[PDB]
Write a protein that binds this DNA or RNA. Sequence first.
RNA 1: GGAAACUCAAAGAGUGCUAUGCGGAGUGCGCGAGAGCAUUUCCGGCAGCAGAGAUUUCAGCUGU
Lengths: 109, 59, 182, 166, 460, 458
Amino acid sequence: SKTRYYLEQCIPEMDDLVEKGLFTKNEVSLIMKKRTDFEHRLNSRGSSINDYIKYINYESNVNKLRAKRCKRILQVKKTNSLSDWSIQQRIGFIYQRGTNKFPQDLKFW
Amino acid sequence: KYQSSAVPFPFENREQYERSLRMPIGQEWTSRASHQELIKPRIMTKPGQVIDPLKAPFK
Amino acid sequence: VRKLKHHEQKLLKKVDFLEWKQDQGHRDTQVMRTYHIQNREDYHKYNRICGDIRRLANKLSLLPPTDPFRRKHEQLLLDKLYAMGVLTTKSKISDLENKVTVSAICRRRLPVIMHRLKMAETIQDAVKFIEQGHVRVGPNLINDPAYLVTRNMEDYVTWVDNSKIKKTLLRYRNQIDDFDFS
Amino acid sequence: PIEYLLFEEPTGYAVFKVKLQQDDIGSRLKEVQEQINDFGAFTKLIELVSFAPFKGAAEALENANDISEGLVSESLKAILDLNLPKASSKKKNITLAISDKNLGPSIKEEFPYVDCISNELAQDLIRGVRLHGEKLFKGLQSGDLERAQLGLGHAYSRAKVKFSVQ
Amino acid sequence: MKIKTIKRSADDYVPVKSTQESQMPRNLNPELHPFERAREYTKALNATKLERMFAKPFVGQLGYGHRDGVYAIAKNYGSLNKLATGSADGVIKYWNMSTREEFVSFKAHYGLVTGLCVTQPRFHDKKPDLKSQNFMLSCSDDKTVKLWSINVDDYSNKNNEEGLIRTFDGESAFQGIDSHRENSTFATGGAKIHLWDVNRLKPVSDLSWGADNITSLKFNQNETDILASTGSDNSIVLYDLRTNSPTQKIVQTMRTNAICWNPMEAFNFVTANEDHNAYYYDMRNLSRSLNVFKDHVSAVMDVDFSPTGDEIVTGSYDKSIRIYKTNHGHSREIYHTKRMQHVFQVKYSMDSKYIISGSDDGNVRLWRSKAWERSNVKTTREKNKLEYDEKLKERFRHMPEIKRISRHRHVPQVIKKAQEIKNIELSSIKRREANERRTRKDMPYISERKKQIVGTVHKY
Amino acid sequence: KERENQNKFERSTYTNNQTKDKKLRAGLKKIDEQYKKAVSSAAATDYLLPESNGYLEPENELEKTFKVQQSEIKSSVDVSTANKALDLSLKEFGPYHIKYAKNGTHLLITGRKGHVASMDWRKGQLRAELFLNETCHSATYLQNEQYFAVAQKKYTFIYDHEGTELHRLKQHIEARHLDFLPYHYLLVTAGETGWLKYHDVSTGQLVSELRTKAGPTMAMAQNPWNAVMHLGHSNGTVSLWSPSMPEPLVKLLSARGPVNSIAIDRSGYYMATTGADRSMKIWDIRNFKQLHSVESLPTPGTNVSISDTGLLALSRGPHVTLWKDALKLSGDSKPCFGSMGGNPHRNTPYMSHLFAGNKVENLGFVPFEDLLGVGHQTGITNLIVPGAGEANYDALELNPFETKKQRQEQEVRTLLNKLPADTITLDPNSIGSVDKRSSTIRLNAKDLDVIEEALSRF
RNA sequence: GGAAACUCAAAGAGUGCUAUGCGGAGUGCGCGAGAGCAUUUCCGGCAGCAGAGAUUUCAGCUGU
């Protein structure tokens, strides 16, 4: 199961994002829950581009909430941590996975 | 017949041997990323191409 | 349990969940299906007796060939096993190891001699009848199928009267007399 | 060293990149000749990277004629110089895997920076990709191959035999 | 008062639709997973049992074999699936190893063929087309060296000059060949070692020390100007072609059959000599043969490295080849079959996967190197499992029943008898040496690696 | 890199309280460097485990945790768990011994008269329901729901999934307590005869006919971490045993009189025992030190069971009393019955439940839920105990959503990786060691009267 | 005693299914380049200017 490999690829950014005070563990476990479900639906069998689209949409929304709580709690534009590039680089990674798995639809392209 | 007879060659006494054997490497007791990075052989060849004798440095 | 692959079958040959070594080929199960034995442990309370008489015949053969205690007790045991009908002939003492079987001491049971003299037609039906209480040996009725018979009582195995199977077979032959109430 | 191969289909040309090389010495082994029958282990060898369909069925018949006479046609020229990387002087000559030694020298003349391989290994993974076929493309085409080669077969037969219309 | 329990919720754990895969939620607690050591020990037992039941190393021979017996084999060092093979009736062939048959064959010389290699020549009057045809060459007993073409069919750039593009002639016999892998200069061992290129029909240099023949020789794979040879003075002689001179000689006890350099270390080679062990020598300090691979019973006829540089292969005069790790000194694995006999030339294919063994009964055979692995592409769960229990066998290697299983092979009983009586006489020599060491004042300890050296010119 | 559960994730070694070889030095520094990396990246998983354990708390100063009604928590908990708290009422057959599977998936009930039923309890699924006429003392599952062994009047029988019998054991000439060592595939039996005997149930072999030399075996209990079986005889002796050596490994003397029950913590680190002296003891096991000893509980403790989160369960005849935080090493964590004048340094019990009139013959927790199945005279009851379960089960070994195909594959995987019957050891990390003899440092064959002085010389 | 199912349990075979791995730059090398080397070299800061782009985003300057 390579879904476990992706799911514990995404741990260190949320580790640093929790140890600096912007999320707490009681909700990063919730976003980890939904991320687990998304990764399973993604690299399961009989998957679909709409699953990729909703994963992209959810990760963009948690990126925007990350920036919102960054400028609200820490009152800075960024905290120069690992997270700030990580979340959009894994958005691009989702995009790359979806183009390799489904090069048909020009909408996702 | 389960504990070994002497201390094997690269080590020198039993604290060396047990400090080698102290961490299980299975995917049960260790994570998947630490699994797949803990286990990979020293050589690793690509399956179907001729291996050149190395000519480094200053090409 | 999974009809294992070739390498798994090679890596474990001695596994068998169904049939172990100490089942002895499931002979207790096989002969109790053969003779329709109701309860458990009946095979082994027969096999204890079979081992007991070969132990006693062993000790009697060990005793020397001249003394009357040995010769009287061996002809006495041979006649007792003939009178219980476990044997069929008053044969040699070698048949007390070749011929005594748990199958034979089962073969003198009530439903199997009932099927043997064609009272029922299968031993399951015989246990049906004598569990419903239709048969008797001599005067007294038999309710349990564990009553094995003697050599004497293979002749008075007959149903009770007002047994409606007796009534239906007599009315089949239309020798149904009804003054004798059956 | 087989980096690309070119597969010619009734609907159009396809060019595949080769991710992993097949083994060269044990190529007559059971466990290697069964991985070109397993699809999920044939796709560990071959990735689809381009597919130019024929525009019209007249061009389909024209390309079939040009391949049968071993010539290079212009759509084939287009897909080859789109996909194949230009090399340096003589170091690392790029390599196609085509299906015939008569198509060999013609595209060698059209592309002097390209080398053509048609050996047992090339025909091996060619017949692997022919066997699996339309499952490689994952729908990236406009055409069904059996009916397409039905029409192309009657066309090519008719044009070869000069069957009259009146 | 606040009460909450588990909320198992039956949706994250069993999928909502009947195709997507369920979670395997997972807690890496040592409290959860009870027996670490016993469980992975038994996995190591199962892995050693599985390799002992999957060790099926013989691939197949190639062609119908030779006529008299393979005495020379040369892989080509720039392509994978072809090698040249010459047998001592005179017949040399160019085998393609994919389809397992020859491209062409020839009756090359009258007597034996004693050496052959492959070449990427450079004439000064031609672009030498090394892709549509392929050149080998061979020196033999009838005082001739012949540089030979082969119309190979691997590329299809073209559409004829099959055999014997030129002949060299020598006044004495010849025994060995190898080629400087640049500038088309090759070198022959005969009654005296000659260096010549393919452009002129005379020896460009004599190179010998004195009057002793040169039984074999081999160029280097890197620092290609340097080369080694072995003469019937029981001697190793290194030559450097920049200074155009021999440069050192050691004499050992028994005669060195065949050299092979290292592809990776580039200044370590392996000599195979007639005492029943191969010697991983350095070059810069030729007084201590820095490894001795011991476990044979007869003369070790040739050897070469794997191209990965850490696993070498010896083939010997007893009817068995065996493959050694570099840093052990004992047999990793023994290959033998009943039909192979007096195996003379064993070489290692250029992808470190196959072992080509040319015997004396004619046949040349293929073997796998790792005798339990297989040669197909593997899904990553199989790759992770095989690599996992490979590492696991490696760390539980010293348990005293994993060791007996992973050490158990089946040798032919000739080799079994010879190995055990070699053991009892070696124990006897050790005991009598112990008695003399108990009494006598100064019988100094000599290392096992320094034992076989009987001399060295240029002491420092 | 902090990883607060590193103290949970470390693996200690046989130590001394620096070399000269450079290659050996760099090998060792790479080895313990990757050890630290593997420990840190293994303890970086608690972000990835799905849900936390349940709990309760007073969150006031008036009400307590133990005087909380099952009706109240069944009202305040969700519908699924409130529906899972089943209460079977079976009257005509005897007291009902309770054995769940290793996961929470099935349930085996045995009436002492004749009645054994293997059933799924989450969904109502009859798997095997049989009345065999003779008495059945206790029973258990073997490796799945597919096989269960019942200890009948004398002969121990094992049974298929649908109720057919498969083996009448000619040995195990009687039985009172069965258990199953699951990684070893060993069915272990003990009883009225002084014979602890082990049975390799895969190949159908016997393994050990161990003579106890201590009369009958009043209660046995498996240590789930080193797989030694702890028998508790009539002497008060709790002797713990391995099939490899006949002499009992370690003879604890826990209680006085007979020992009524033993229960081992799932970390292998604590042992709770009740005797007929009205006494309960908590034991360290890895150091063999009596932790603390509740003397004179007001009635003989019938059974003890410890959950998967260290949660003590004591059955006082008609009572069920559960202590949280009772398996520490302090003096606070001694389980008591009263906070004397409201003393905040006592373990007033976590929950308590008094039954009607029925003696509870065995507790037993449910593995991956927050509820314990207690078996009494007139049937079975599940009790909602909110902190009594590992929420984060590991699905690589045992799975409460396991289907048929993965059930077959998981059992054949354990059947290949069955540990042999010899490596049952007092500590599980003594297999890759060296011998205690054949000393540690290796040696590489290089080091293996004046008149008397006048009357010397003669 | 024969027959309905979404009655369940257990095995087997076939068909499928992908089964599926610090950063922009700038700075000198590597034969128009990135496939590596190496970083204070400015930045991933602040407001405004005015050119744009659908309130929030980019393009070049002042101080910083």
